[PDB]
Write an enzyme that holds these catalytic residues in place. Structure first.
Site, mmCIF file in Angstrom:
data_model
loop_
_atom_site.group_PDB
_atom_site.id
_atom_site.type_symbol
_atom_site.label_atom_id
_atom_site.label_comp_id
_atom_site.label_asym_id
_atom_site.label_seq_id
_atom_site.Cartn_x
_atom_site.Cartn_y
_atom_site.Cartn_z
ATOM 1 N N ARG F 96 11.452 35.830 -27.178
ATOM 2 C CA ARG F 96 12.060 34.861 -27.981
ATOM 3 C C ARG F 96 11.056 33.492 -28.027
ATOM 4 O O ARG F 96 10.906 33.017 -29.007
ATOM 5 C CB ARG F 96 13.233 34.399 -27.294
ATOM 6 C CG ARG F 96 14.467 35.402 -27.304
ATOM 7 C CD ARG F 96 14.610 35.981 -28.569
ATOM 8 N NE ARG F 96 15.532 37.019 -28.812
ATOM 9 C CZ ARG F 96 15.563 38.346 -28.324
ATOM 10 N NH1 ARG F 96 14.506 38.758 -27.817
ATOM 11 N NH2 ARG F 96 16.556 39.355 -28.734
ATOM 12 N N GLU F 99 8.732 34.529 -30.759
ATOM 13 C CA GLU F 99 9.447 34.531 -32.032
ATOM 14 C C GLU F 99 9.327 32.877 -32.520
ATOM 15 O O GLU F 99 9.113 32.644 -33.451
ATOM 16 C CB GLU F 99 10.638 34.948 -31.819
ATOM 17 C CG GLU F 99 11.319 34.969 -33.322
ATOM 18 C CD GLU F 99 12.621 35.747 -33.251
ATOM 19 O OE1 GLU F 99 12.367 36.955 -33.559
ATOM 20 O OE2 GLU F 99 13.676 35.285 -33.013
ATOM 21 N N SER F 122 -2.850 19.739 -25.924
ATOM 22 C CA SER F 122 -3.423 20.358 -24.531
ATOM 23 C C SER F 122 -2.272 21.370 -24.037
ATOM 24 O O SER F 122 -1.201 20.789 -23.837
ATOM 25 C CB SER F 122 -3.643 19.386 -23.883
ATOM 26 O OG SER F 122 -4.236 20.153 -22.428
#
Lengths: 156, 156, 156, 156, 156, 156, 156, 156, 156, 156
Positions: F96, F99, F122
């Site tokens: 996830r 995604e 960063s």
């Protein structure tokens, strides 16, 4: 014939235009190859960019499919071969032949070495044909014959 | 048989052991398959991890190769099939069969759809065999027969 | 019938145009398939390049979407199937069905071999349907039915 | 449970051992899950490293299979999920379910958005089952039911 | 909205046009999203092909950016999501967020399972927002909030 | 600390041992990090091979988990970072978060450039934390905070 | 500058047009950068799609190269960075810099951690230059200087 | 030295051993290389499997690290070079040097051809070193010097 | 020559055009290279996008092939080298040279290190020649000569 | 020889053992092959897993290297060929021969088709030889001869 291609997209773009003209004309690959003296699998492979047609055959199939002169010339060039888009087919029909290799690849190696010795069955000195036969249990089968020369690997 | 595998390494490790025993005993795959009632390509594929042997055949090849009981049992398990290390063979002998797909893969599709229609030639309802024959121009050829049932794709 | 494609881009570009026309006309896939006698999943797959429509169905959907005659012919050609751009979907909606395989793929294999034996559940002799149902805990659920013929692997 | 894994090889090695014991004992997955209160697909997935069993079921199946105390505890750990060796299955039985995605993946997306809207069908709030039925044309079919919650994506 | 896309290039091509217009007009994403009732991250994602705008919002941003009617309709279509060219970003700015997964991915899994249990943090029932703050030691920092619903994996 | 690793497998193997010990002792990551003065996400990351613990922390956690002196030293080495097996996670829980990048990656780029300028957020001068909060519509949510320094790209 | 790109092909197509114009005009990168106040490596990288030029520099090189207004604006946009076609260069000249990584990558890591500590040498707060010098054994050498800020990773 | 390796794992396994011993002895790479007459980058690279040490240097560092005689011999073999696990580094510290190629690879090519001509900067006739310098704005910088011979490509 | 390319598609597109014109005029590569002072392998490689032609040769072959002035200039440009579409050739003719590396790659390494020492055989200071000779056994052979300078790797 | 291998790791692990013995005995490949009647490249390739030795040659090199009986037998088995770890070499020495294919691969195809016609130069009926020669400009060169049979592609 000394002319050759280096970018498969040229002959594959041509194959697409051949397939369109063939569809519009309701032609089969058997009819396109008829009269060339060449086997349907060889002629079909040339249309699809994987073999070179001799001049006479290129002109004959070119008339049938109504190809321009540049296209009849391209069909005679020695192709940059490789019909699979990205190494492994996604098409089911096309994939089953790959799966045959995943299941029997090492068995084909084992039996080739057993029967012939170290070396290869050629993909160059090679013919194939597709035959439809009746299945005694119902339906139909394809008998696809791969016929290749054995070339030995010998010390030097 | 309702037992199956999920990690090809188990049966592939057994295959290596079978090949070592077979080498030490100077046996051929035809010799091992003789008396099983099964085709050499099927028995060989099973030894190499790509088919399951019925119990009787497993015990017979187990006796021929001096295999232990876990091994005779493993040969009867339904395998996690796939003999190619990483999708594309590096071995020249195996690679030529992949090259035939790169050269004729779209031709096999085209000719299957023309002769049979939309659908596939099966890799499951499927037999193959390797035959050594004389090359009429000299030397030897392999005639490899892929015999698969046609399964149609039709609307629903 | 006997005409087939080898470059998925042709039918996928047609799919994009169909989807544009469909959106401008406020049409559903259920609506487009109504009156063809074919399941919504089958007609939808054809529009999206993954099945071939029979001629009558091609003309009916073609009229509904205002497709030209070349497009109506293309919808009848046997496709070069494979709807995923590069093997693994990026789209979340499509990905969940892939993750379904990553979690349950070996369970599907195990239970298939337990219930049926050695062999496959077909993707060819195969029906698919998507059903919306209420969730008794609140919300809705999709009930997706994969219906495939069992083909056994048998010794030869 | 709050303990989880990061290296799938631990639970997949346990799965191999489980499969060996299961085969030696001539056990089915249906029997192993019997008396567990849990669906066979869920218990089987746990054995194969893809789900976590509750302590009660871990001890029940552990006894049935003769697992040591470390293995019964492993079965209760939250897994690092992912059963496919290298993204695309080589095994024909597993491959067919991937091919269903290659043929119908975009159809599933299109029909999900048509029936439910923007969002996904869950692979988490999810049940699946495999049923064997007669094929009215002869043989057997698998009816595989994927039952997943719809979760919408909505603006924020 | 029941209309959906299957080829990301259509909306990604639109995105390129949107970006050019936005630059010629000296507009920010905050300015474009102002007045839509929607968060800047959601509207920006829609412009870049990763969300669908409701009709009112689409017409608003269409007026701000001087989009034609086909474009305003495309922005309302449900997209084929996936903004990364080829799985791993090359762009340093995008890559840093992938690197956070390479360093903390298993930690996020571990802590999610510890605090919530077996299951997932949703990427669908999900909000994200980017805030610029001072760095107490000099400079600026980005505080990026991922706010996702927990969905448990529960036995069945 | 000037000692570093070049083969992630040594620290990931250690992580596996740590997770086993932690499971047997029924410890949480919150519990293990307690008393170190370090955030749970940093200590968890170190145990999982992605950070180096200062000596005092290494001895503390090493006592809690009953680690041998070689392991307490390994935890102080600077790691070869990279927790994902093969670039893209297979596990749903960690997928996830990948995604999220496929959906919002370009949005994160666009908003970072808008708010800060050319450059990066960063992943090194960086903190993250995981917080569980109630969902007013029912259930629970994870609020995950990524807090990174902005470093500008400036002409030279 | 708050405007950024998400499709590298736009700036890379502009690079091709820039290179053709530059060759037609017999210009060097040193001449193009002359008068911009910016280092040749920075201006060159901008022309090739990997940096953003300040407005005055964009107009200056735009005049030298005869670029249209849309191109001068494009050169000022923040790019979607990544100059390598497909991860590993094929060109010998650029490949040697990758090989330098294959040979010394872990040495650079080890020595950076030894001299500076845990953390990174920046690719963002970063200058590089190429200098041609005599080889004392005869011929020429390139001295390429990578000048990057050290950013530590410290516990939190 | 005429002996060479073909499997990098042998020397990379040795490197891991070397690193553990080095950590146990609280040694720096600078100390290990002291007295060999060889640059710290060359000796470090040999320890990490990417160079061959001359006999006297191998005996010296082997004594410092308490290496067995097989290991001292291995350090003198010409290696199978390639330190990156799988083509692109996952470690942030090593990744930054790859990112320098993604951003400046084409600029390095362009400037090499401008200054030297058609050909390459050698990775073989090649020196590198790492120097720490103070940053006038605060902090530390790494100045990494890549020093390679230019080899021209000339027609034949 | 100080001008160079960064996108191979420009010169490869020109190669396709060159091949079409060459086929129309029934020219060979030996013929095209005649009177340039340059080996056929070098001139051929330049036409196919892999070398730069000096201006005199570029104009001679440009005349022979009816190339426009942009094209004659492009041929003089230093190319972005790399003739293989996707790392591994699909064409059988090209593939055999790759298979030589799969079979003899480590033998070439071993024998180079044995006869010369640590280092490389150059692909830059390099000549390539193809000659056809009669096979005493019947048929013909290609004798392909790779003539590269040895560049040593020595400690520094 | 009818016995063959399917897992390259067996012969490559033997190659590693052979290289260790060879280094401990300060042997060259030329001396190991002396008295076999076989070319050094052939015997070397066999030791490295890529060829099968005849029994007398296996015994003679087995004596020189003090190999056990199972090893002398393995050297006689037909190998699973493929010496490159993962398709593209990382080692500089081996990579240069791949780079020759990236630069000259299409030129080799073009010149083979021009001088011989459609078809291939064999990697099977093939011999290779490495020769050290003085460079008249200073230093040494390797003259590597690839001598392969031409096999034509002809219509059928």
């Amino acid at each position: 014939m000394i002319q050759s291609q280096i970018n498969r997209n040229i002959r594959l773009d041509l194959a697409d235009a051949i397939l369109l003209s063939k569809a519009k004309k309701d032609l089969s690959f058997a009819e396109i190859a008829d009269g060339t003296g060449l086997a349907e699998a060889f002629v079909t492979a040339a249309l699809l960019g994987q073999q070179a047609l001799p001049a006479d055959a290129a002109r004959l199939v070119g008339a049938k499919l109504d190809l321009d002169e540049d296209s009849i010339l391209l069909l005679q060039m020695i192709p940059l071969r490789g019909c699979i888009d990205d190494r492994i087919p996604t098409d089911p029909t096309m994939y089953r032949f790959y799966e045959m290799l995943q299941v029997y690849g090492t068995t084909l190696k084992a039996l080739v070495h057993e029967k012939f010795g170290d070396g290869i069955i050629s993909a160059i000195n090679f013919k194939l044909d597709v035959k439809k036969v009746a299945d005694p249990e119902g339906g139909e089968r394809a008998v696809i014959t791969l016929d290749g020369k054995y070339l030995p690997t010998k010390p030097f």
